[PDB]
Symmetry: D3
Subunit: 302 residues, 6 copies
C-alpha cells in the first residue's frame, strides 16, 4: 500500500501524481544526496516523534552545498515538509522519511522529494549480525568524501555488502586506504572492550553520523562510559567484548562476530543492551532528558 502523499519541489502531491519518464533522472542520480530520518510512533501520546530532524536537514543542506547544488530549499522547508508529510500521510506507526536532493541539467536546477513509508523497528528485539572485513577498501576524501551522503558512495558499500552475503556473513565492515577500520556499509561501528566504548574518529573516512553522535552522548551522559574516537586497528576489533552497527536504518545492531572472531560478552552484550534500551526510550519520547532531539507531530491515537 503506497503512502497517500509525498513532497516534491516545494509541494505535497498525491502519491500517484508523482510519475516521471523511465529516462528522467539517471544522470541526476550521480549527484543525488539523501537523508534517512526516523519517525517513532508513541500510541500512548498519539504523537509521531521525528528524531533529530534539524540535524538531518542541516546535514542534507551541507551535503547539497558540497555537491554544489544551487540554493532552492532551506533547512526549515525540509523540516516542515517532513512534519507536514508525516501528518498528511496519516500513518500512525514507525516511519522512515527520505529526503533526496538532485541536480538536473551550465545552469543545473536543484530538485528534491521527500517520502515517508512505514518502517520496522528492532529496538525491542535481541538479534546479532556476523560481520566480515571486506577485501574492498572504503572511499576516502581524495576520491569520494565519505562526509557527503551521496547515492554514489553506496556503489563502494555494495562491493562490500554483496561479498559479505556470498561468503556467508550478514554484513561488511570496511578498512580505509591506510588499513584502519572505517565504518559499516550504511552505518558507523562501535566496539566495547572493558567497558570503554571505541569508534573510529571522523577523519578515519566516515559519515558525520547523527546516530553515532547520539550513542556517544548517551554513552557519556547516561552511562558515564569512556568513549574513544580514534584510529581503530582491524585486529583489536576481533578482541572486542562487544560490537554494534548504529545509524538511522540500523538503529543499534549487535555484531556477534567479525571474520569469525566472536565478541566475548555476546550480542547484544551488556553495554549494547543498555545503549539499545536508552536509545529506544529516547526516540519514543519516554525520556524527557533528550526531548530537544524530538520533533512531535500530534496526529491523535491509533
Amino acid at each position: 500500500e503506497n503512502p497517500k502523499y509525498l513532497w516534491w519541489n516545494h509541494r505535497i502531491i498525491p502519491w500517484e501524481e508523482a510519475t516521471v519518464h523511465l529516462t528522467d533522472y539517471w544522470w541526476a542520480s550521480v549527484t543525488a544526496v539523501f537523508e534517512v530520518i526516523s519517525g517513532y510512533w508513541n500510541n500512548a501520546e498519539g504523537e509521531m516523534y521525528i528524531f533529530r530532524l534539524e540535524d538531518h536537514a542541516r546535514r542534507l543542506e551541507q551535503s547539497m552545498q558540497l555537491i554544489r547544488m544551487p540554493k532552492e530549499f532551506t533547512v526549515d522547508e525540509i523540516c516542515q515538509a517532513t512534519i507536514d508529510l508525516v501528518r498528511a500521510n496519516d500513518y500512525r506507526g514507525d516511519v522512515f522519511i527520505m529526503p533526496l536532493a538532485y541536480a538536473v541539467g551550465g545552469d543545473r536546477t536543484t530538485e528534491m522529494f521527500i517520502y515517508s513509508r512505514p518502517a520496522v523497528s528492532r529496538l525491542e528485539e535481541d538479534f546479532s549480525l556476523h560481520a566480515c572485513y571486506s577485501s574492498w577498501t572504503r572511499i576516502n576524501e581524495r576520491v569520494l568524501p565519505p562526509r557527503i551522503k551521496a547515492l554514489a558512495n553506496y556503489r563502494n558499500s555494495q562491493l562490500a555488502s554483496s561479498e559479505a552475503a556470498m561468503n556467508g556473513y550478514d554484513t561488511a565492515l570496511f578498512l580505509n586506504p591506510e588499513g584502519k577500520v572505517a565504518e559499516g556499509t550504511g552505518s558507523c561501528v562501535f566496539f566495547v572492550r572493558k567497558g570503554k566504548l571505541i569508534t573510529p574518529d571522523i577523519t578515519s573516512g566516515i559519515l558525520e553520523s547523527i546516530t553515532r553522535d547520539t550513542v556517544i552522548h548517551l554513552a557519556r551522559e547516561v552511562l558515564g562510559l569512556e568513549v574513544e574516537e580514534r584510529v581503530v586497528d582491524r585486529t583489536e576489533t576481533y578482541l572486542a567484548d562487544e560490537a554494534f552497527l548504529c545509524g538511522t536504518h540500523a538503529e543499534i545492531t549487535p555484531i556477534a562476530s567479525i571474520d569469525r572472531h566472536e565478541m566475548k560478552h555476546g550480542a547484544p552484550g551488556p553495554i549494547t543492551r543498555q545503549l539499545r534500551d536508552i536509545y529506544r526510550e529516547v526516540v519514543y519520547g519516554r525520556d524527557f532528558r533528550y526531548r530537544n532531539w524530538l520533533t512531535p507531530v500530534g496526529m491523535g491515537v491509533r
Copy 2:
C-alpha cells in the same frame, strides 16, 4: 521532441508508456551500468551505421557481471534491441544509443532500457578545449573499478568537471592515487609528442575505451604511428605537441592547453586532424577497411 520508442526489459514500447514513479529506482541507480553507442547516418546510403555495437554490448555484459547482476539479457539481445529501436524510431540522423542496466530489490532482478536520441557530431568541426588537472584523485580498483562503466563512477567525474568550469577551464583531466595521468572525466586522453602517440595503459586506472582501442588501431594501421600505452607523468603532458580526449560522446576532442601549458602544434594539431578525419570516414561507412566495426541498419534516404 521525444523518440517514438524505447526498449525496456525485452520489449519496444512507445516512449510515453515508459512512465514510473518518482521514487522508483534511486537505490537501483547505485548499481547501474550503461554504454553510450553511436549511430552515424549516411544519407547517401540511407543506412545508419552503429559503431562497434557488439564490443559495446559485450562491455555492458561484463560491467553487469562485475556488478553481479543476475543473468537476464544477452549480448545478442542488446545488439538486436539497439538495431530494432534505431529502425523503429525512424530518425535519419546521428544518434546516441544508451543501454542502462540496473538491479532492483536477497533476490535482486536485472532490468535494462535502451533509448536512442538524436546526437550532434563535431567530426567536421575544428574546436579545442582548455583542460586542467583536478585537485581531486581518480577512483581506483581498491575502491571503485574504473573498468565498470557505472553511473556511480561519474560522482568522482563531477568533482573534477565542476572544479574545471568554476576555475575557467573547459574540461578536467585526472591524476591517479599514485600521481600518474588517469583519463578525462568521460573519455580517454591521448598525447602527441614527436609523432609518437602516448596514452595511459589500462592499469593506470581507466575504462577499457572502445574509442581508445579504435584510435590506437587507426594510428598504428592507417598512419604507421608508434603508440605507447604506459604510465604517463603530469609534467610531460604539459610538453605535448598535441593532446585530445576520445570516447563515444567525445569522438575526438582536441585539447588546446593543460593547466595553461599550450600544446605546441595547436588543437587540432596535425596528427589529431588526421585521426579525426580517418575516424569520421570510418564511422560514416566511407572506409571499407574498417567495415567489420559497423552494423548497418537500412532505413531508406532522408
Copy 3:
C-alpha cells in the same frame, strides 16, 4: 632605500660592503634555512618590539642542526645580532628581520647573514583572501621535512601559489600525501566552526609555527576558546564559519572562501577580528600579559 647595515658571519657591515660574485652561493642555497622575525615599532614608547626572538633563533638553530650545518653561531649571537642590527639601522617603523644560514663547500663551513628591512603591517586593516586547494601535494617527512624552514621547501610552495594566481585565487592551501589539510604556502591555517578553533596537528606535515603557537595561546588564554589540533579533512573547511592564514609575514590573514565555498561569518569573522586585535596589541607592546614574548630595543621616538 637600502638598510644602512646588515650582519654577516659575526659582524655588522655597511649594506654596500656585502657584495659577492653572481656565482657564489647557488649550491649553498639548496641547504639554506631562514627565519622571518617581526619587529613592531611603538612610537609612543620609542621602542621596537622584536616578537619571540629567542623562539625564532632556537627554531633556526634546530633547522641548522637537522640540515647538519657545523656549529658556528649560537642562539644568543642570533638574538643579539638582530637587536644590534635593528638599533644600528636606525629605522623607526615595523621591520622584517631575516636570518639566513647556509653551508658552503667534506668540510662544509656554516655561514649566516641577517638583514632587517621595513615591513607593512595589515593588523589595523580588514581584508580577506580567496583560497583554493592546490592539485599539488605538500612535501612530507619521507622526502622533505616540513619541520625544516628551508628555502628548498618553498619550491613545493610555488607549484601551489602560481596555480592559485593563474586560476583566479589569492592564495593556495595544501593537502598532504594522505589527502588531509596541511598548511598554506607560507603560513599555518585556522578554521572556526561554532566558536571551536581548528588547525592541523604538527604531524599533518607542517612547520612548528610560532604564530600558530601564539594564536593557540591567545585563543585559549584570552578568549577561553576550545582549540583542536588534529587531522583536518578538506570538505569540513568548506563548511568553516571562518578561516585565516597565520605566520610572521601573514600576521592574521582572513580567508573569505576556499574553492569558492564562502566562510559563513565573513572574513574577518568575529573570532578572527578578536584574535587579530589581541595579536596586534600583543606585538606592539600594549598587552603586559604577553611581555615575555617581546624583546624591546630602545631607539628614541620617531
Copy 4:
C-alpha cells in the same frame, strides 16, 4: 684562478663585473633551474667538443617552461652563449658549463647566467664507489617533479648524500615513495645482470638524463646489448653483476657495492669498462658515428 668571462642576461662580461648584493637572489634560488654541460678538449684537433649542447639547452627551456618562467631566452641563444663563452674564456681543457635560470620578483622577470670552469674527467681512470640505499625517499611528481632540474630538488639529494657519507659509503641511491629504485643523488643508475643492461623507466621518478639517453644508445647501437627501462626492485640490484652512476658530472662512475652487497664482476666490470671507453671516444670527438652529438668550438692547439 677565475674564468675571464661569464654570460649573464644576454651578454658576456668580465668575471669581476658580475658582483651582486649578498641579499640578491636567495628567494630567486627556490625557482632556479640549471643544466650541467660538458666540454671536452681535443688537443690534437685544437677543438673543444660541447656534448649534446642543444639537448641540454632544450631541457633547460622545458625546465623553465614547467617552473613558468616568462620567455626571455631561446635555445639558440643558450647554445650560442655557451659556444661564445667557451671561446672567449680561452681555456683549452675539459670544462663544465652551467646555465642557471631564475625568476626575480605578479610580473616576475626571467634571468640566466652561464659560466664555464675547468673540470676533471675520470674516463681514463678505473675507480669505484660503495653505495647505500638512503632511509630518505625520492621526491615524486605529486610534490616536486624530478623531471625539472631545479636546485630545490637537490635538498632531497643531500638528505641521502650526507647520510651516505656519515654511514661510511661514497654515494646514496634512492627508493621512490612506492619502494622501487629511483636514481642516484645527481645521476641515473645502471645495473648489469647477465649482459642485459637495466635502468629505471622515467616514470620511476627520475630526471630525463641525456647521459642515460647516451648510454642506452651506445649500449644498444655499439654493443648490441639488451637494455631494459623498467620498474627496478632494491634486492635485484644487490645481485647485479655490475652497476654504475651516469650523468654529465658523473660521466660513468662504477659502483663496487650497494648496502655492502658487492657487484659480482667488479667495478668497473666488463660491460662498464666498454661503455666507459666508447663514451670517452664519443665525447672527445674520436668517434665519427656520434658526431651529431658534438658542437665543436675551434680555438687552436694548447
Copy 5:
C-alpha cells in the same frame, strides 16, 4: 615411514641421527630460507629427474646472500647433496627435496639441511580450485622482499590461506599494497583471456618462480602463445577464460573461479590442459627438447 637419510651441514646421516633440542632453532627460523625441488621418477628409464636443480640451488644461494648468511655452502654442494640424498634414500617415486638454510647465533653461523620425502603428483589428474582474493595485502620490498623465499614470508601467506578456507574457498590470491594482483599464497598465478596468457611482472611483488619461468618458456616455445608479464588488475581476472596456480608444490593447479566469478572455458581449460601435459612430459623426461632442465639420478627400475 621416514626417509633413510637426510643431509645436514655437509654430510648425509641416517634420519634418526638428526635429533635436536625442542628449543634449538626457533630464533634461527626467523632467518630461514628454503627451496622446494621436485624429483620425478621415470620407472621406464629407472631414473629420477630432478627439475631445474641448479636454478633452485642458485635461487637458494641468492636468498641466503640477501638474508646475509655467511658463506658456508656452494650451489654445487647443494646440487650434489640433493643428487646424493635422492640416490641414498633409495625411494623410486616422485619426491619433494627441501633445502632449508638458517643462521644460528655478532658471528652468526650458516647451517642447512636437505630432506627428500615422497610426493603426490597431480599432473595426470583434472581438478580445479575455487579462489578468493584475500582482505589481507601481500608483503612488499618496503617491509619483506617477496624475492626472498623465507619461512617468515609465509606468515603473510597464512592470513590469506586460513581466511580462504573459513570463507568456503580452496585457495587465496593476493592484492599488492597498490591494489594490483600479486600471486597465490605458495605459487604464481596465470590468467588465460583469448589465448593470450597473462601473469603479474616480478616487480608486482612476487617470487622469481622457476615454475612461472618454465610455463612462460613452454607457452611461448611449444604453443607459440603470447605471454604478457605486466601489472594485472583484480576485475580482469574475474573475466579470465582460464586461470591456474603454478609452482613446484602446485605443479599446474586450475582455478575454476575467483570470488565466485567462474572462468569461461572451465578448469582445466584448453590452454591449461595443454601446458599441464607439456609440463608433465618435460618433468618426467619424455621431452628431449627440455632435457637441460633435468638432472638424472640413475637408481635402477622399481
Copy 6:
C-alpha cells in the same frame, strides 16, 4: 649449563627429554607466537618475582587467537606452568621465561613449550646505544599485524638490525609505511623533550608493550610526568633531550644518539635515570605500590 626442566604440552619434563627431529616444526615456526617474561630474584626475600605474568599470558592467548590456533591452553595454565618451572629449575637468579605456541599440521593442533633460562639485568648499569633509522619500513596491519608477537614479525626486525650493525650503529628504529616513527626492532621507544615523555600511539603500528604500559604508568603516577601517545615524526626525535628503548629483554635501554644526532641531556638522561631506578625497584619487589604486577615464587635464599 641447561635448565633442569622445561614445560611442553601440559607437562614439565627434564630438559634432555625434549628432543625432536631436525625436520619438526620449521613450517610450524611460521605460525609461532611467543612472550618474553622476566623473573627477578630478590635474594633478601628468597623469592623470584615474575613481572606481569598474567598480562603476558593474556597477550599470548590473544596472539594465539589472532593466529587462529585452536584452544588447548589457558591463561591460568601458562601462569602456573611458568611458576612451576621457575620453582622446579631451582635457579635463584634473574631469568627470562619464554612461552612459545605453535600450530602443527585442516585440523591443525596447538602446542606450546615454556623454558626459563638465566638472564643478565642491566638496571644497575649506566650504558647507551647509538641508533639509526632503518631504510627498511615496519610491517603494518595491512600485511603483518604488529599486534601479534609472532616469530615471523622478526624477519622485518632483522632487515633493520643487521643494516644497523654493518653501518656502525648499536640498534635500529623503524619508520612506518607513512614515514612516522614505529618502534625499535624488539622494543618500544620513548623520547623525552622538556620533561614531557613521548612515545608512538598503538595504531602507529607497534606491539601492545607491557613495558611501554609499565613505563607510562610509572612516569604518570610516580613522576607526575606528562606522557604523550601520538603520531611521532622522525626529525623531532633527533631533537629529543633523551630517548630509550623499553621491553622485557631491553628493560630500559638509553639511546645516546639517533642517525648521529645526540640526545641533549645524555644517555641515561635524568628522566631516564629516574624511570630506570623506579622500574628496577618495582621489578625486584622493593616497591609495595606496584605489588599487584608481581607474582612471587618462594624458593628460599641463594
